[PDB]
């Protein structure tokens, strides 16, 4: 029902490659789940430290 597929190389890939560019991310401002750097651009200091 929620059967989803990944390999270990592809999964380690998208674990590494999720913050810098993201295919699922919205590339137009004003939409949710934007690029991680743009989300950081408005993030709070506590938020960014949790990211660290």
């Amino acid at each position: 029902s929620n059967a989803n597929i990944t390999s270990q190389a592809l999964n380690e890939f998208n674990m590494a490659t999720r913050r810098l560019f993201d295919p699922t991310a919205s590339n137009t401002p004003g939409q949710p789940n934007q690029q991680w750097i743009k989300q950081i651009n408005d993030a709070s200091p506590a938020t960014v430290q949790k990211e660290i």
Binding site: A43, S44, A46
Partner: peptide, 30 residues
């Protein structure tokens, strides 16, 4: 009796501290 301007100045100043501390806490993200 006429009100001393010190009291009104302090009341306005206190409202500014309240507003500005809420803004700073907002900027921290809280």
């Amino acid at each position: 009796q006429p009100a001393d301007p010190s009291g009104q100045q302090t009341s306005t100043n206190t409202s500014n501290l309240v507003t500005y501390l809420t803004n700073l806490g907002k900027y921290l993200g809280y």
